[PDB]
């Protein structure tokens, strides 16, 4: 008998993430205008479905795009996704505030790049939220004049 | 298992803006003054400052504005931006900030806003795990950006 089956409950880790550090084996990869220079938004995990969605942005000749990757776990406890070539991506340590990754990409050339990362979770409690509601009601400020910044178009460049 | 010593300059660092709301829809509409999308906060418990870094679209175009509030001896604070400002600390956490602010603009009139707010917090061993699993994989230091500065100081 190999490993044994892994009880897996990421659903809940679903949410707004962003990106700390990255690195390349290949630093052309993550340099400006490179395909992995990725900041995060949005993470949601499937438990069911064994998927993990990536909602990252990126910029490419000179224009920043909205990227949706979609990855698909294995009987290997990896995933892979395909973006920029094909990648199989392992979670090395994983909790309700971070995340640390290794992923192996292997570009239309057949070019091997390795990279890791570190990305931490934008959590935002009931209790933080309630109180913000009740101090926003006790003002007289209407719902539809509150504005919502973590999930906005309308945001600054890093670059 | 530890955790830092508690501090008010603990609190320094990266913070996002989640919601703000207002009393004049005017003021956090595309253009609008108080539309700020936060970057970093530093407090100062000796000099009783507290020094905010956030960017706002004016004109079609995003600019990095730095503000410095004075605390008073009722603990509210107060600080020079478009127009005069009395920011109050409702509650505030490691991770959160849930803040009344008073603005009164160069025309005598009246704004009031709330904010929720929160902080991107990096604990040391995950640094530590990331950096191990880095040289794992022979990749140099110098390979290696740093995203949360390229955040914090946009353009
Ligand atoms: C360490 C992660 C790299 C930087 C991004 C890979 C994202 C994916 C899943 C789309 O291949
Ligand atoms: C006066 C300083 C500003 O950063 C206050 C922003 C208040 C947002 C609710």
């Given at each position: ?14 949410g707004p ?105 934008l959590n935002v409690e009931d209790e933080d939220l309630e109180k913000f509601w009740k101090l926003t009601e006790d003002k007289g400020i209407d719902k539809k004049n509150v504005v919502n910044f973590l999930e906005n178009?309308?945001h600054?460049?890093?670059?």
């Amino acid at each position: 008998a190999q490993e044994e089956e892994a009880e897996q409950n990421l659903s809940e880790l679903s949410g707004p993430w962003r990106t700390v550090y990255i690195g390349s084996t290949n630093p052309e990869k993550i340099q400006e205008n490179g395909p992995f220079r990725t900041y995060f938004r949005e993470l949601v995990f499937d438990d069911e479905k064994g998927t993990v969605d990536f909602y990252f942005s990126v910029k490419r000749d000179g224009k920043w795009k909205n990227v949706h990757v979609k990855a698909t776990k294995q009987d290997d406890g990896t995933y892979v996704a395909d973006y920029e070539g094909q990648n199989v991506f392992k979670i090395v340590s994983l909790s309700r505030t971070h995340l640390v990754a290794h992923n192996i990409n292997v570009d239309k050339h057949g070019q091997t790049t390795e990279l890791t990362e570190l990305f931490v979770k934008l959590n935002v409690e009931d209790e933080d939220l309630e109180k913000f509601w009740k101090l926003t009601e006790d003002k007289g400020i209407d719902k539809k004049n509150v504005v919502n910044f973590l999930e906005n178009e309308n945001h600054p460049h890093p670059e």
